[PDB]
Every structure is written in C-alpha cells, then in structure tokens.
Amino acid sequence: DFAAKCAGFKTSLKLPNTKVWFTEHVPAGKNITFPDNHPTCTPKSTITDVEICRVAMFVTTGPKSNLTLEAWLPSNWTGRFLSTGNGGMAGCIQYDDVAYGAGFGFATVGANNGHNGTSAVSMYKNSGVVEDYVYRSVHTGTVLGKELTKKFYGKKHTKSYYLGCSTGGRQGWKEAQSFPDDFDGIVAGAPAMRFNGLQSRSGSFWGITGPPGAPTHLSPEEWAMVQKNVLVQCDEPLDGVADGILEDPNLCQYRPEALVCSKGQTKNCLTGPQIETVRKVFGPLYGNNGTYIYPRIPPGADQGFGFAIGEQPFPYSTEWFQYVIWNDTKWDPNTIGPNDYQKASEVNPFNVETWEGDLSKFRKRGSKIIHWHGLEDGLISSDNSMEYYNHVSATMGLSNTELDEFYRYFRVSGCGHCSGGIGANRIGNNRANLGGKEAKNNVLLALVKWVEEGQAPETITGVRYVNGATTGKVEVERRHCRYPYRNVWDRKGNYKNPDSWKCELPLE
Numbered sequence: 001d002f003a004a005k006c007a008g009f010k011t012s013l014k015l016p017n018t019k020v021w022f023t024e025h026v027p028a029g030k031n032i033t034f035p036d037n038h039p040t041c042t043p044k045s046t047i048t049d050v051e052i053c054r055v056a057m058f059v060t061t062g063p064k065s066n067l068t069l070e071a072w073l074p075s076n077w078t079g080r081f082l083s084t085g086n087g088g089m090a091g092c093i094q095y096d097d098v099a100y101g102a103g104f105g106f107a108t109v110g111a112n113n114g115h116n117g118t119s120a121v122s123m124y125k126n127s128g129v130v131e132d133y134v135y136r137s138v139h140t141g142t143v144l145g146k147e148l149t150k151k152f153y154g155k156k157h158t159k160s161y162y163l164g165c166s167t168g169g170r171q172g173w174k175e176a177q178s179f180p181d182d183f184d185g186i187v188a189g190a191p192a193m194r195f196n197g198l199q200s201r202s203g204s205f206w207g208i209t210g211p212p213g214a215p216t217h218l219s220p221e222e223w224a225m226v227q228k229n230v231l232v233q234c235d236e237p238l239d240g241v242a243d244g245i246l247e248d249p250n251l252c253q254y255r256p257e258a259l260v261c262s263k264g265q266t267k268n269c270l271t272g273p274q275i276e277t278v279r280k281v282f283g284p285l286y287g288n289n290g291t292y293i294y295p296r297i298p299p300g301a302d303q304g305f306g307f308a309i310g311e312q313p314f315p316y317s318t319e320w321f322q323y324v325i326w327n328d329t330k331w332d333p334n335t336i337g338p339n340d341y342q343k344a345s346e347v348n349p350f351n352v353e354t355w356e357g358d359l360s361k362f363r364k365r366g367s368k369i370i371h372w373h374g375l376e377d378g379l380i381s382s383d384n385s386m387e388y389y390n391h392v393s394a395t396m397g398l399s400n401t402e403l404d405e406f407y408r409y410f411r412v413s414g415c416g417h418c419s420g421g422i423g424a425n426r427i428g429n430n431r432a433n434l435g436g437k438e439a440k441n442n443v444l445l446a447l448v449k450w451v452e453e454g455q456a457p458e459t460i461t462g463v464r465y466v467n468g469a470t471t472g473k474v475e476v477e478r479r480h481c482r483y484p485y486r487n488v489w490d491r492k493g494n495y496k497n498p499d500s501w502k503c504e505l506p507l508e
C-alpha cells in the first residue's frame, strides 16, 4: 500500500548533500499548512486535489549556501516529472503550483531559490545564495527530483516538464538556454529575463518621477487619468473594439500632450514635467555611450503598475543594486542613473541576464517551450518578451515558421502579471489564473499534448467568467495569438465570442 511506501522512503532515500527531514502521507482533499515558512511567504496553506507523498529535504550547496527542496509524489502517477519556480526576489516555495501539478498526476518538485523570505538580504556578501537564485536551485531540484522519483516508483520518468511565472519565467528560460537536457517541456510566463535591465528599468521610474510633491511625480489619480486617455487614443481606433483592452500594444504610440495643462496650475491635467515623465515611462531606457538597457512599459499596462511606480522607491531593485551589484547598503535609489545600469550589466552574477538567443541544443534534442506574456502586465514589460523572440530569430538564423517547431510566444490580451486583468485572462498557468482543463484552454495541458502527441498549439485560449469569478459561466473567451500574429476582430460577430476574432500575419 501507498502509506507504507511513503513512510519507509525517508530512511532509504540517501541523495548526495541532501538530508531528508521527513516523508508525509497526504490523502486527497487534505489541507496542508506551512508553519516553517517565512512570515512574508505565500501561501500559508494549500488543498491537495489527490493523494500524494510529501517529501521534504535540505540540500547543502556550498560552505554558506543551501536550498529547501520539496517533492510531492502522487499515488496515481502518470509517469511525468514536473518542476516549479519562484517569484520576484523571493525564497518561497510556490506550494499552490506544486499542488496544481500534483493534481494532474505529475511528480512535482519545488525549491526556495537558496534562501527564505521575500527579501534579498541573504544575497549580501554571499555568492552561493546568489548562485542558487540565478540557476542552481531549479537545476539541483530537477536532478535530485528525477533520482527520488526514479527510486520511489521503481521506474524512470517518461517526460520532464517545467512551469513558472515572473521570476519562474526567467528560471524556465535559464533552463532552455543553459540547461537544455533538464526539460522536454517548459512553460515560461511573464519572464523576468534581461534581469539586470529589468532591475535597471524598475529602479529608473523613481529617478524619473521623484517623490510625491515634486513636479515630475504623478499621483495614483493622475496615472489613472493617463490610462483612461490611453484607451481613448489607442483602444477602439487601433483594434475596433472598445473593451478597455489593447489587443496589440505595438501599434499604440501614446501622446500625453492631449492632457496638457491649459490652466495656471494642475488639477486634472499633465504639466510639462509630468508630460516628460509619461514619455519616459512609456519609452525605452538607454544609458552610457547610447547603450540600450530595457524597453518601455507599454501603454495600457495597469496591472502591477503601482508597485514599481508609487509613493516610495521600489524595494526589489534597490536591494538588487545594494546587495548584489554595488555590495553597499549606503547606495541611494534617489540618484539612480546610467552608471548603475552599466555596472549591473558588467557584474551580471552567474549570467542572471538570461538573454541568450542560441537555443540549438534545446531544439536538437526535441524539447518544446511555450512562452507567454500578459499585455496588461505593468510590473514586467511584455515588449521585453517580444524583443527576446526577435533576438532568438536573429541569433539562430531561423524564421518564425522554423521557430514554431520548438518555440512559440503567445501574447495574452487583457491579462496582468501572471494572474488578473480585465479580459479573457484565465489560461491555466496556475490555480489563480485557472480556466478550463483542456489542451486548447490550459497551457500546462497544451505543453503535454505538444511534447507527447505532437500537437503544436496554434493559439492558447483564455477565459473570463461572469463578474470576473473563479469559475462558472464563461462571459468572454478569446484564442490568444502567437507572435508575430495579431488578433483581429472581424467587424460583425460578438467580440466576446472566440470565432469573431482571427490571428493574422499578412504576407502578400
């Protein structure tokens, strides 16, 4: 029986540099709490959908660096191995994603990126902790995960898969670029790739806006005004459907001078300095010697906008420059500029940038990757993901049709950072953004069908339930297009209906 196997697995499992804390039988529907998690970590608890054996481990990686790996092994095992990622600067095991994977019969694993808690203070004067964050945590979890999965069931895994979002998307791309043999399938959502450029980008907004009271700064009401005016200029005029959703933000070049202050002083208008701020926020970041750092935040990208651009400076970027790049807690985010952006690119710990165009090894072995990004994502720019696709195409010397074999990037209209947004956003990257449980409308199942049955996804279907609910009646559904296709409304059918839209890439 399964409970006897799980209890006895504790003593028998002797992996190298690995101390097994415990093995726990967890039946279907049981609520598992996480009391040893950091106060900042989320979630505090998760409901498992199926019977599993929850293995907990401590993996020492260096003299002063270590991981906390967990492996959730289901009783109704399909043969598939899965690995989860992390988010932001966090050392939090994403337990909802590990349980989500376990629910579909995957032997799922998840690690804490080399530290505990959302802060990156652990990285200060510690190369081993940074090394785990950049690549080694997810890699070591995958190698050890396969060995324990092999030893537990008494047979090797059929296929290896990855599912990650935000920082997880970067971690998935790190694997596709530098560790191609680890995974057969990868889902990389809203990737934090070009990571040093992203922290440079996120840090620069404070330097542009300044603190509240300053002439360059915009309040939450003034930013809300700007995003409404973005829809006036760019929503219906560019996609023909006034739904508050920009279907293709590439076509939108917003001009904030439409809201110029005719009055003597501001009230519900943009001053000269505020116009300068919006163009910099909706414009690219360059640096020393005219070098290109990171793209704009696209107009309409309201989801997760307040975190980076707010009343105080952005903590993740400040900590990155303080602890990792400059190695100084005295570093001031108020005086951020070109010299900081240049230094981050030159330091680039363990190639955390993750901007490698050559995916030959990944293609050669026959691995697949589904890349996706929400178009309302205001925390990480979707334009960055567009530029990576083109960087890969240019580096490898392969057209979009050749890339379709192994690499497809989907642009999800009306979807925020990983979850949320006001459009047909639920594509099944995690529980929070879960819609249907079919290949066409669940990206995890789409990845499985592509790797095993050879069904390459033409689109990925997202949904919005009534009143933006977790489940129920489907209000809006749209088949989101892969780059460089554009989703075009047919000018007759109901825009909520999938069949009214069409993915177009004009060649004649």
Ligand SMILES: *[C@@H]1O[C@H](CO)[C@@H](O[C@@H]2O[C@H](CO)[C@@H](O[C@@H]3O[C@H](CO[C@H]4O[C@H](CO)[C@@H](O)[C@H](O[C@H]5O[C@H](CO)[C@@H](O)[C@H](O)[C@@H]5O)[C@@H]4O)[C@@H](O)[C@H](O)[C@@H]3O)[C@H](O)[C@H]2NC(C)=O)[C@H](O)[C@H]1NC(C)=O
Pocket (backbone or CB within 6 Å): 127, 178, 324, 325, 326, 327, 345, 346, 347, 348, 349, 350, 351
């Ligand atoms: C703060 O402290 C840290 C150390 O804790 C300092 O970080 C080092 O910064 C220096 C530059 O100031 C770097 O030295 C450079 O190294 C270059 C060699 O290639 C590395 O850097 C590349 C970036 O373009 C990177 O792509 C490459 O990655 C490859 O090797 C990795 C292992 O090293 C591997 O994991 C990857 O997968 C990949 O194969 C290399 O890391 C060289 O061309 C330069 O001339 C220069 O010598 C160090 O690399 C940095 N080391 C670390 C660990 O971050 C930092 O400078 C300190 N800052 C201050 C202000 O004091």
Ligand SMILES: *[C@@H]1O[C@H](CO)[C@@H](O[C@@H]2O[C@H](CO)[C@@H](O[C@@H]3O[C@H](CO)[C@@H](O)[C@H](O)[C@@H]3O)[C@H](O)[C@H]2NC(C)=O)[C@H](O)[C@H]1NC(C)=O
Pocket (backbone or CB within 6 Å): 031, 032, 033, 044, 045, 046, 047
């Ligand atoms: C799984 O177990 C956990 C832990 O026992 C349960 O979490 C707890 O859920 C209750 C509500 O049922 C929470 O109480 C509420 O907390 C909020 C926020 O502080 C407060 O505003 C409410 O007034 C209420 O007190 C409790 O905080 C929460 N505890 C933890 C540690 O998360 C969870 O409900 C269980 N899940 C299921 C499906 O039963």
Ligand SMILES: *[C@@H]1O[C@H](CO)[C@@H](O[C@@H]2O[C@H](CO)[C@@H](O[C@@H]3O[C@H](CO)[C@@H](O)[C@H](O)[C@@H]3O)[C@H](O)[C@H]2NC(C)=O)[C@H](O)[C@H]1NC(C)=O
Pocket (backbone or CB within 6 Å): 021, 022, 036, 037, 038, 056, 057, 068, 115, 116
């Ligand atoms: C980072 O957080 C993780 C949890 O996410 C910590 O893991 C926990 O580590 C403690 C040891 O400090 C483990 O306690 C042990 O429990 C076993 C079983 O009851 C017992 O035999 C031991 O004597 C000990 O008390 C705990 O099991 C473990 N929890 C999990 C889920 O792995 C980790 O320690 C933290 N690391 C750092 C550096 O703070």
Ligand SMILES: *[C@@H]1O[C@H](CO)[C@@H](O)[C@H](O)[C@H]1NC(C)=O
Pocket (backbone or CB within 6 Å): 060, 063, 064, 065, 066, 114, 115, 122, 126, 129
């Ligand atoms: C794990 O690493 C942290 C530093 O990142 C350190 O504080 C702790 O002592 C280490 N634990 C072990 C058992 O090596």
Ligand SMILES: [Ca+2]
Pocket (backbone or CB within 6 Å): 235, 236, 239, 240, 241, 242, 243, 244, 245, 246, 247
């Ligand atoms: Ca629209």
